[PDB]
Symmetry: C3
Subunit: 222 residues, 3 copies
């Protein structure tokens, strides 16, 4: 369509769709109930992203937010996606290391705060206050990363895969608040079409890439 | 009120209300914790439907969607209802057969996708794209029905009741995408008042009827 | 700002923020997984309230509802807060007494109905119908309080702390439907600035006060 960012929404839609089908076919047959959990969690994340990318591509997951003088296009469906997919990613990690439920509740809740305050930030019409919401969101992110590194006798297989996925998690997740801040939601330093491209590369990496690492690991079997 | 479909919203409200009270009285006394789960899940479904039918009856759960040239009345509160009640129905099934958590997560998540894409479809202003959302929603439905039939040593009591409720589930759930497609949300072949009547009969059957079958079964006791 | 109720939103924001930091520091070190659950649940409640108070203070969590002839300011973010924080409060209670899952599902679901019908009531433009939603909401509240008193060999420590928190719960929770009914959401007998002050005192008491009682108890350790 008109919107130049359309091609990145179309590619994202396609890549999430293909990833969903791949993981779906891949988990056919699996009977190990622990493996089943990782396959469910891990197939569901790009299925949800597929629907949210498609909603952006079709125009449904877009709204206009007045701020800094103008009508800023804001892809709210990114935050619907993340609201459900980032806790499932953290569940994949938590399950791997057999986390305490209290620890899982702290992570899912901090994550909810992260995404929800990010969405408030994205929809806030008072420009300076958008960055107050960003800061709080970023503090929840930093709580989550802290817990992943200082909050957790696993089998050596779990440990190696967990350490890989944890490091993937820190580099990819930490990029999101930077893209937001320099993109059209924040300081407007990078244009929306480039902003959309960067979140597309992160999304596919953090969903389909992450899942490929994890579903190839023997850490997922009991 | 003016809206001819009001009588079906009023009857639905009444039938869900009476069903809620019946199951509520019925489960008084029960102490078998397994039975308690089935009674909770099963009383909660028509209590939620009661509130959503009433919201439609009062006009709150209605909005107007422009598409195909006109202002189409869309009862969004149907999708709020279903968003919470269809996973609880699937939980009743999953519990009955002592499903793996991975299997339950796949079902609840596919269900979320089903209802959420149905709601996007219902609110989409570009007429052809409403049916893309319908198709995806229907594919999630077909995943869920597949799992119920090819994804599951139960006691013979569980097996007989599960088989009954599973067959109820397939016939009733499969009717919903057809009603949507022929009703005012889709091709507009059947008028809104008839559409509302058909979803009312399905809703009461799939909630109050289903629950009556299940709560009469000894399959629910440990 | 202009709104006289701002000072109560500012104090609430501050008190929830300080409470969040206090519980956060307080739970550093804890390793007893049961204690961890109570600390997570209990730190998360004022963290969420902090964000929702701040959203009200900044103006984001406010909307205007036409009814009784006028444009009534309605702080919808109170209901987002409560939607997540009241089930976590009930979880703290349920965990304490080692409730049956069926009993926990009945409580969380009745609670969802309570808050959701309260939000419908708050946003309903037909004045008489606001009180139909209030009545249903209040009936869900009374179900929840019934269960807390007639639905539950605990260690004597659990019993004493549970009995304290249960009595706190009844007096504080029962005040909310009264404030709503006499405040600007309901009969408009008490002005919005006083209404906001009363919910602020209840909120801080029911979150930060409650949590202080509970986290000081040895009932939370295995
Ligand atoms: C948990 C535990 C802890 C909770 C975290 C605390 C922070 C709370 C944040 C929450 C608040 C939600 C934000 C809400 C969308 C605000 C809506 O108002 C918008 C701006 O005035 C209106 O924009 C108009 C359009 C906008 C679009 C917003 C849509 C969004 C979609 C996400 C909903 C999903 C649910 C899937 C349902 C099917
Ligand atoms: C920061 C506290 C410690 C945390 C508490 C929450 C507060 C968060 C906001 C920080 C604060 C400076 C925000 C003020 C933004 C202000 C510079 C924008 C300039 O105002 C311009 C008109 O006056 C807006 O036009 C438009 C001009 C724009 C292009 C300006 C872009 C703004 C940028 C904001 C970047 C914030 C970071 C760099 C935060 C670092 C941590
Ligand atoms: C760090 C700690 C919390 C910081 C409190 C803030 C300080 C703002 O005080 C007033 C100075 O004008 C702002 O009121 C001026 C009127 C406006 C009110 C702004 C107050 C809020 C924008 C900030 C309240 C706390 C924030 C917390 C920022 C995120 C934190 C978790 C890192
Ligand atoms: C997206 C590109 C990577 C740009 C970022 C530039 C960094 C380039 C290298 C990425 C990093 C890779 C880390 C390798 C890991 C392997 C080490 O594992 C350790 C052994 O247990 C774990 O201990 C402790 C683990 C330690 C590793 C923690 C991760 C670090 C975080 C790196 C920055 C983040 C991404 C922020 C992006 C940037 C814009 C600020
Ligand atoms: C899970 C796991 C997987 C998630 C599934 C993936 C598919 C994502 C779908 C989700 C997105 C939610 C749709 C959202 C209502 C869109 C809102 O925008 C509408 C159309 O522009 C605005 O219409 C204006 C009015 C409309 C009304 C919509 C209201 C709805 C109500 C449902 C909310 C409920 C929550 C109960 C809260 C009390
Ligand atoms: C289908 C793919 C395999 C799945 C991928 C997603 C695409 C889903 C949409 C299928 C597609 C044909 C939709 C096109 C609808 C088109 C016939 C409507 C006619 O256009 C009219 C004006 O040109 C609209 O006015 C109004 C006239 C209306 C009364 C027309 C009603 C439309 C009907 C659509 C029915 C779709 C099914 C019959 C799908 C069977 C599976
Ligand atoms: C709403 C009315 C029923 C209209 C539909 C017309 C069909 C009339 C009979 C309904 C069906 C009843 C099935 C009986 C069942 C009993 C068999 O149990 C089997 C023994 O384990 C289960 O194996 C395998 C189980 C097999 C049964 C699977 C269910 C079938 C699905 C039937 C269609 C669906 C409803 C779609 C509605 C229509 C508009 C397409
Ligand atoms: C469970 C189990 C059982 C469910 C209980 C049954 C009762 C169902 C109630 C639910 C319905 C939700 C109400 C919904 C906000 C209605 C929206 O329409 C409003 C009035 O027409 C539009 O006002 C315009 C603005 C308004 C603002 C409303 C925003 C609200 C915010 C709450 C969302 C939170 C999710 C955090 C996401 C980030
Ligand atoms: C009640 C049933 C058993 C439960 C079923 C659901 C019905 C709930 C509503 C009860 C019903 C009387 C509500 C009618 C409100 C009516 C008195 C308001 C007067 O109408 C005025 C114009 O005619 C409205 O202007 C504005 C004037 C206002 C200041 C009037 C305030 C209204 C007050 C309502 C208080 C309701 C309780 C006192 C409920 C006690 C339980
Ligand atoms: C007590 C039991 C349920 C009470 C049913 C109500 C009675 C209303 O009947 C009609 C009298 O005019 C209202 O229709 C007149 C047109 C309007 C329709 C109003 C009916 C609804 C407002 C009430 C439906 C039941 C309510 C339940 C109130 C809460 C209950 C759970 C305590
Ligand atoms: C907010 C202020 C308190 C105003 C309310 C006026 C009441 C003043 C005293 C508050 C009450 C304190 C109860 C003490 C408790 C201790 C007893 O424990 C018992 C021993 O197991 C529990 O049995 C059974 C437990 C019994 C206690 C159940 C609680 C009672 C409920 C009190 C009313 C509620 C608040 C409604 C507010 C008002 C506006 C209607
Ligand atoms: C290993 C196989 C079978 C995977 C392919 C399934 C689905 C689609 C491609 C997903 C691959 C991506 C790897 C994750 C990491 C990222 C940094 C990818 C970002 C995009 C790069 C574009 C180059 C080609 C692609 C179409 C993958
Ligand atoms: C078995 C008893 C005690 C049940 C009655 C409790 C609550 C209300 C009626 C619910 C009954 C419905 C059976 C489920 C199946 C359906 C196909 C019903 C659709 C509607 C039919 C209208 C005929 C009468 C009714 C008012 C039930
Ligand atoms: C015990 C300690 C360390 C607590 C302080 C941490 C956080 C802030 C204050 C929370 C205290 C409140 C007690 C709960 C009960 C309520 C009825 C309080 C309502 C407000 C009263 C105003 C008086 C002073 C306050 C700022 C606490
Ligand atoms: C599937 C996509 C994933 C893993 C997305 C992760 C998104 C985040 C970590 C977002 C973080 C943000 C902040 C920390 C600051 C405010 C803006 C956000 C929401 C982009
Ligand atoms: C309590 C009500 C129940 C059991 C409702 C079930 C609803 C569905 C199975 C809806 C399905 C739909 C599709 C498959 C296609 C798009 C439209 C929907 C949402 C009606
Ligand atoms: C953290 C805040 C808490 C514990 C808030 C509790 C809120 C309630 C118990 C609200 C109850 C209401 C009703 C019973 C009637 C309708 C209005 C409400 C939502 C205020």
């Amino acid at each position: 369509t008109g919107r130049p960012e359309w091609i990145w929404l179309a590619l994202g839609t396609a890549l999430m769709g293909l990833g969903t089908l791949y993981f779906l076919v891949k988990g056919m047959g699996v009977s190990d109930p622990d493996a089943k959990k990782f396959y469910a969690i891990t197939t569901l994340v790009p299925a949800i992203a597929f629907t949210m990318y498609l909603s952006m591509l079709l125009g449904y997951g877009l709204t206009m937010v007045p701020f800094g003088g103008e009508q800023n296009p804001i892809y709210w469906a990114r935050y619907a996606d993340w609201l459900f997919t980032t806790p499932l990613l953290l569940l994949d990690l938590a399950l791997l290391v057999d986390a305490d439920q209290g620890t899982i509740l702290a992570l899912v809740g901090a994550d909810g705060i992260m995404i929800g305050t990010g969405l408030v930030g994205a929809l806030t019409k008072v420009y300076s206050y958008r960055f107050v919401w960003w800061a709080i969101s970023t503090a929840a992110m930093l709580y989550i990363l802290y817990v992943l590194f200082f909050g957790f006798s696993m089998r050596p297989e779990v440990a190696s895969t967990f350490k890989v996925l944890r490091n993937v998690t820190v580099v990819l997740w930490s990029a999101y608040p930077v893209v937001w801040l320099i993109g059209s939601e924040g300081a407007g330093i990078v244009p929306l079409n480039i902003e959309t491209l960067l979140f597309m590369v992160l999304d596919v990496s953090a969903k389909v890439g992450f899942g490929l690492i994890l579903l190839r690991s023997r850490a997922i079997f009991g």
